[PDB]
Design a protein that fits this description.
The structure is cut from a larger assembly and holds eleven protein chains of eleven kinds. Chain A is mainly β. Chain A has helices at about 5, 10-15; strands spanning about 40-55, 65-70, 70-75, 80-90, 95-105, 105-110, 120-125, 130-135, 140-145, 190-200, 205-215, 230-240. Chain E has helices at about 1-15, 20-25. Chain E is rod-shaped. Classes of the chains: A mainly beta, B mainly alpha, C mainly alpha, D mainly alpha, E mainly alpha, F mainly alpha, G mainly alpha, H mainly alpha, I mainly alpha, J mainly alpha, K mainly alpha. The interface of C and G includes residues 2, 3, 10 and 30 of C. The structure holds digalactosyl diacyl glycerol (dgdg), chlorophyll A (5 copies), ligand SQD, beta-carotene, CA-MN4-O5 cluster, chloride ion (2 copies) and 1 more. The PDB classes it as photosynthesis. The entry lists the keywords PhotosystemII, supercomplex, photosynthesis. Cryo-EM structure of the C2S2-type PSII-LHCII supercomplex from Chlamydomonas reihardtii.
Amino acid sequence: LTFDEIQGLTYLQVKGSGIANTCPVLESGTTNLKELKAGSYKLENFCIEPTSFTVKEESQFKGGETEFVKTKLMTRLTYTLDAMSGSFKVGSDGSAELKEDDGIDYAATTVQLPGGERVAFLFTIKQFDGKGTLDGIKGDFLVPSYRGSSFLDPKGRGGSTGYDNAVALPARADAEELLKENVKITKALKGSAVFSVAKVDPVTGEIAGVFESIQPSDTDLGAKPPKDIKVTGLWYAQLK
Amino acid sequence: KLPEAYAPFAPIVDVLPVIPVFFILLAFVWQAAVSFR
Amino acid sequence: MEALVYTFLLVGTLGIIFFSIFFRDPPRMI
Amino acid sequence: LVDERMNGDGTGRPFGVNDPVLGWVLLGVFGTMWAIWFIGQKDLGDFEDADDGLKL
Amino acid sequence: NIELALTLVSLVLVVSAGPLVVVLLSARGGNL
Amino acid sequence: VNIYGLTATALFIIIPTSFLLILYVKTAST
Amino acid sequence: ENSSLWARFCEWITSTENRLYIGWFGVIMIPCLLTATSVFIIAFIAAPPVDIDGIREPVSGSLLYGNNIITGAVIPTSNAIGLHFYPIWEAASLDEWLYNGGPYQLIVCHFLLGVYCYMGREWELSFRLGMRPWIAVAYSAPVAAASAVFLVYPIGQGSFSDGMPLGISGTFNFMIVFQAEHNILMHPFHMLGVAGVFGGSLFSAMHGSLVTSSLIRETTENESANEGYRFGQEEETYNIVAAHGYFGRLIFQYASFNNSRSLHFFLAAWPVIGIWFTALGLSTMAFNLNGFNFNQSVVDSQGRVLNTWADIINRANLGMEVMHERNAHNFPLDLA
Amino acid sequence: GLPWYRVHTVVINDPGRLISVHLMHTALVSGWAGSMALFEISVFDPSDPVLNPMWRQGMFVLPFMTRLGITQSWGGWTISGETATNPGIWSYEGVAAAHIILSGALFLASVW
Amino acid sequence: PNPNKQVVELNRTSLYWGLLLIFVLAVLFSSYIFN
Amino acid sequence: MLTLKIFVYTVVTFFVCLFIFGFLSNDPARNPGKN
Amino acid sequence: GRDQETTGFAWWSGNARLINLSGKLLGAHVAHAGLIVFWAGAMNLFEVSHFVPEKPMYEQGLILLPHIATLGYGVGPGGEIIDTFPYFVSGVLHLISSAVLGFGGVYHSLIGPETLEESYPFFGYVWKDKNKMTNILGYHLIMLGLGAWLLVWKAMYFGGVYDTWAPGGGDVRVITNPTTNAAVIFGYLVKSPFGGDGWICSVDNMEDIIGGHIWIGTLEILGGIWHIYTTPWPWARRAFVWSGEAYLSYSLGAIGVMGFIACCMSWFNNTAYPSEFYGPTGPEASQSQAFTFLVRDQRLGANVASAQGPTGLGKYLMRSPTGEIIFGGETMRFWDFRGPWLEPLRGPNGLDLNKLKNDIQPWQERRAAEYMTHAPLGSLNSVGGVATEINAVNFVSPRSWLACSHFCLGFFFFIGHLWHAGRARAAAAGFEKGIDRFDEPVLSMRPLD
Ligand SMILES: CCCCCCCCCCCCCCCCCC(=O)OC[C@H](CO[C@@H]1O[C@H](CO[C@H]2O[C@H](CO)[C@H](O)[C@H](O)[C@H]2O)[C@H](O)[C@H](O)[C@H]1O)OC(=O)CCCCCCCCCCCCCCCCC
Ligand code: CLA
Ligand code: CLA
Ligand code: CLA
Ligand code: CLA
Ligand code: CLA
Ligand SMILES: CCCCCCCCCCCCCCCC(=O)OC[C@H](CO[C@@H]1O[C@H](CS(=O)(=O)O)[C@@H](O)[C@H](O)[C@H]1O)OC(=O)CCCCCCCCCCCCCCC
Ligand SMILES: CC1=C(/C=C/C(C)=C/C=C/C(C)=C/C=C/C=C(C)/C=C/C=C(C)/C=C/C2=C(C)CCCC2(C)C)C(C)(C)CCC1
Ligand code: OEX
Ligand SMILES: [Cl-]
Ligand SMILES: [Cl-]
Ligand SMILES: [Fe+2]
């Protein structure tokens, strides 16, 4: 559906359909990619819809190579980044600058490996700053810690609030297992994303394309090594 | 409150809702008076 | 390992339920 | 998008049908078993006169 | 407090008014 | 001292011991 | 012959000569309570962990995921689903159904629809055997209490995640969280329910011992006294006058029941009415009516709070509610 | 009466109890086959098929499933050393379950 | 009403052979089972 | 998933129509008590 | 009066003595219908006398005044109470009519004939007469049908009813266009009862409500005329018990469902049960909390969209499981809540945060902050918080009283169904007094059952 076909629906008609989880496809407009007028644009209704989640999983086998594997999704329809505000700049020749500031720019998402391993992650592009030509707007965002600092584990340990030890084992409350009780690390990592503007509709100020990002998964507050997750799919924005 | 031409009758009104509890009790008095035949 | 022991105790309890219904000592009248 | 849904979680469909074959499931299974009951209604008594129920 | 006192007088005249039917009808007549 | 041999010894005793006790006390009461 | 296909099926369904009676409630009861039984045993053993709280932390309840019989449970449905209907066919994958607490809502929908028809066929066999009907009315009290914990309290609180977990230690979590949010101990309908199960255990031991202590001497001391009764004998194997004339001496003479039919009605009506209230007490607290709140009720002169035992219950109450669902609450009022 | 070693000869005269007593043995044999295949899958290490294969690990009935085509599992792994994208219903665990489901069906037939 | 109903008997001398047999096999083989 | 939903709706409506037409097939006369 | 040995009923089941006494049974119902009208008169005037205009209608423990307010008598824009005299006339006209109903109820119970069969043949009835039972059933459907047209005439012609979804805020709105589309009206009935559907408890506007009572008014006038001119068909002779206790048990199971429906109706719906009058719903007060701290903390310099919670889902705004931008927290379960203060902030794709960063209106945060401190949790002695709360306020929501009373009444009348449907089916079969002791039907059955 286009943007105007979504906005021509009431809330009860789009509810429960999965249409609300989708970015507006840009049906009108051409792939010429030059009639986009140069200059600055504040970028609202910027929304990113993924299509695949693949994680860099180490092989089950001993001499197996480590690639990106197909996954199936555990969280239901909570994964689209939507309605992000920011600035969009294009040059005279085709050099473009994509930047977002505010909006729903993170989406916690659990995805399950073939083999039964549930790897969770937050799909984000938050604080993005990317530069380059309209086939690649290569830049880096940050991935925050998947749980906050006031998150509490099943034993009550946590970063900001919490015990900081295993209280139910009072003789070995603090021991050589302090990797997961004495430090709850909430350090934010970094992820890289590549945007490519594919269609321009300059009479309405609407541009869409394909994105490709790679980000870390989750560290369980500093208890497991985070894994790399390659997210592809579509995106959409409104120049105005 | 009630309309002010009736507010002196507001003491009677506070007793009026509990009256159907007395109607189920009156069935027990009437049956006690015939000795629960 | 203990989950094998847990299910054996649960299957064994459901076994006695099956025998207590379909192989009960039948009540003889008179 | 990522996966494939049926997408009827909060849509309020009549008897929860969204493929029309589901409505014919409802009418086919009701209609097959209405017809078995109707043909077998000759063994249930002809309660034809007015005072012919289980009454008190 | 006359507004509280009349509510009690209205209670007693009504809480008696049920058994007073049963008492009076027991004495004269008796078809209850 | 293994988990197998300590309980395989106990099962090879008690499962045939009690089986023979089931048949004897059946017989000695007849 | 003259009988149709449907008529020979009706005389088999309503047949009193089956070993387990089926009835027309049993064509619902059997395929429902075999559905919920089969998916209970598979999910108690082998279900992957469940995001009960909707906050994307999974909770393990299966024997194959490191649980024993006490701590294992079929975990309630996700809080993100709420009261939404989540069958298998509304999920994308079967593992998404397993992640979001899907097995719970399939057990609970078939179990409740199976115990409503279990109650229906206790009526039906009573009607087929020429009995008086109201054993079903007695069984309506555990049915209502099962309906309160799995259906009505989720309906009032707005999620099946607040329904009772299908396990031993999951039940205990459900009770402890309930007392923090609703104060069930200070509710009179739970007080009446405790009086129904303490009275119902007193009266089971009372009626059970007076009959046992009044058995006519029929056997010797080398054989159990339970062989003095024959199944189907028409004489009455104990002395009701000796049992009445004993409990009459014990407390008061007119306190006892000389009528064994009136004794067994009161023996049925004390647990059933008591469980009827605690099923409604749970269902009124479903709508957040709550238990009596006597906190800071006793105040001396100069306006200062004297504590009571209810204030100590509150200190135990508000210790649980600051720790239950410890990551769910972003906002200071547990309105859900 | 009979000795202990002669008890099963009550079945030599009636063929209906001979069905029922071979059905119970057949329920125990396939009940072993699924239970042994569940035990072997629960202890099999499919990591190195080159230098820690199934005969190296004590797998007894897993080379009999793999001999007649069953190469994939519901844990993703295969025997040749790759990931199963579609394990199907005839996995190792599907066949270990198909013998237990048959074990209970043959059990009920023996009671009949 | 099966006419093929028989009873098993085991006298005490056969009890004493049977109990001896499974203890002597347990005396013999368990040295190998415990290894 | 739709194959499962069609199957469950055939199954559930089979047993619901057994329930409904069973009580329409002269249930109140299936008593032992004569009048 | 009457006694035990001439009936076989003790004092504690003595209303069962007047089963076959048509005139006594008439006075039993008319005197009881006096009590329903007497309570509705007395509890109305009790609530008019204890009405205080400085407090909301839902704070004061008023459950009957919000019903007359929903009809639009004496209310202004935004739920403001203009005058209380329309609530006073409703109290007196029931309190005076209760004496008229009380008189003829006492009349037919004491002086009127015991059975009105031989003297008044129009009113006389035998319970097994299937024509006369449908005849009385048809008379009362026309009364229920014409009663359902009173709501339609009052909404279309006689001043209108209160529409809480009205443009410009909620006030009294004449419903000029009631929805008579059968696909919309009968779409609620075949809708699922679960989350996002709510069977018929989600009827979201007054046009479906008033247009639905056109349907229930015509079908009961037509269905009343149907039962006056017909008798039950032979398949209905085959399925039912035709005693008076059976007809009671049929009504008890029908009305015990209706108690369960009105339990979940008053708890969830805020259109036929407006929140200006009944207070916020369970979903409404929990969504009002998340909206209140989304406006509190946004003015304190925090981006409410980019704010990550401690679990990583989003403290203020998260995504619904079908993809709608909703409020975060434990109130993700009530995301399918719709409210007339909240729906102005909601676009197609869930809530619109562009509309929610710039166009939060000052009346919306007035009303949502009112609903947070009037959540439908209380105590049995009307304290008014969570169970861990001190004696400060005096509040239990009417929705909390209306749902809890009508689940209990709906539960007992299902029990009353199971009592009387078991008994009337067994008493018509003959074995309600016990086993015959001569032909015990178990003794003529094959053992090892
Ligand atoms: C999204 C959509 C979802 C689906 C829709 C959901 C909502 C559906 C609600 C519809 C309303 C249902 C109400 C049905 C009431 C049935 C009551 C009944 O027990 O009804 C009982 C009566 C009994 O009728 C009487 O039955 C008698 C029985 O006689 C028999 O027995 C007699 C002696 O008793 C004589 O011997 C006689 O010869 C012998 O024939 C007589 O025949 C009378 O003539 C006859 O009037 O039935 C009748 O009146 C007629 C009954 C109504 C018609 C039933 C139609 C069923 C469906 C048909 C379409 C099927 C499609 C199949 C598709 C296939 C491909 C997949
Ligand atoms: C297909 C194989 C088969 C079958 C159907 C039979 C069937 C029979 N045999 Mg024969 N038998 C067989 C093989 C078989 N036997 C073999 C291989 C031997 C050599 C050891 C014998 C030696 C033998 C003798 C010497 C006698 C019989 C007798 C009998 C009859 C009664 C058996 C009984 O009551 O046991 C009762 C057994 C027990 C109560 C317990 C036995 C426990 C032992 C230790 C085995 C443990 C069971 C183990 C778990 C199963 C593994 C078995 C393995 C093959 C997989 C019955 C007709 C008797 C007969 O003819 O009566 C007139 C008799 O005297 N059999
Ligand atoms: C809503 C409640 C209700 C109603 C309307 C009735 C009505 C009736 N009952 Mg039932 N009953 C009830 C509750 C009720 N009962 C309860 C709760 C019990 C259990 C305790 C019983 C137990 C019971 C038994 C055991 C019997 C009845 C019988 C009767 C009938 C004869 C009454 C009679 O002779 O009394 C005569 C009694 C009096 C005249 C005493 C005075 C009571 C009057 C009516 C009070 C009126 C007060 C009112 C303010 C007047 C207003 C007047 C108006 C102008 C404003 C009558 C139709 C009898 C029956 O079946 O008849 C065949 C019978 O035997 N009842
Ligand atoms: C069923 C509908 C219904 C509903 C929803 C309400 C709801 C309400 N009423 Mg109304 N009321 C009702 C019926 C109802 N009442 C009836 C029938 C009467 C006539 C007696 C009244 C008379 C009335 C008055 C006079 C007042 C209210 C008030 C109130 C409010 C607070 C009530 C309270 O604190 O209860 C506390 C809770 C209880 C009393 C629990 C009730 C449980 C009962 C007693 C059953 C107990 C079980 C027991 C074992 C059975 C007893 C029999 C056994 C011994 C044989 C609330 C809005 C008050 C208010 O706010 O006024 C503005 C107020 O002053 N009501
Ligand atoms: C107070 C209301 C009332 C009552 C008690 C009755 C009572 C009766 N009616 Mg009448 N009727 C009424 C109102 C009423 N009617 C109205 C308002 C209409 C007009 C629409 C009719 C039109 C009508 C006709 C045309 C007929 C009856 C008939 C009957 C008899 C048998 C009904 C039966 O067994 O249904 C059993 C019901 C079913 C088998 C249907 C299946 C029900 C399941 C639950 C599915 C329902 C789906 C449906 C769309 C509702 C979905 C929502 C639901 C889940 C809440 C009985 C005497 C019959 C008779 O003998 O009369 C001469 C008959 O032919 N009625
Ligand atoms: C409108 C509904 C209705 C009608 C007309 C009848 C009519 C009848 N019933 Mg039924 N009954 C009903 C509902 C109804 N019942 C319900 C809902 C239940 C379940 C609780 C029962 C359970 C029931 C039983 C168990 C018996 C009857 C019996 C009877 C007969 C005589 C009753 C009598 O004299 O009462 C006399 C009244 C009393 C003795 C007083 C009882 C008062 C109790 C303690 C409640 C007090 C009110 C209290 C405020 C409510 C608290 C609960 C609240 C929290 C919801 C009569 C045919 C009897 C009979 O003969 O069967 C045919 C019989 O044994 N009924
Ligand atoms: C697989 C399910 C789950 C497994 C659960 C494991 C634990 C089970 C615990 C319960 C064990 C049985 C208790 C006692 C039963 C009893 O005494 O019945 C008494 C009846 C006697 O009835 C009479 O039996 C007569 C035959 S005879 O007399 O016995 O020869 C017959 O003629 C007559 O009609 C009949 O009335 O016995 C029988 O009918 C048949 C013989 C039963 C033999 C015992 C079975 C032992 C269990 C083995 C199951 C497989 C186990 C391995 C796989 C897991
Ligand atoms: C001495 C010895 C030996 C032998 C051994 C043996 C022989 C063993 C056996 C073993 C076995 C023989 C085992 C078995 C097992 C079985 C099982 C384990 C089964 C199970 C089943 C089930 C569990 C089922 C269930 C069910 C039912 C009942 C119905 C349907 C459904 C179900 C599935 C649920 C030898 C010589 C080798 C040498 C060494 C030593
Ligand atoms: O779900 Mn189970 O517990 Ca009725 O509060 Mn909020 O939500 Mn949850 O927390 Mn507290
Ligand atoms: Cl918790
Ligand atoms: Cl929250
Ligand atoms: Fe007894």
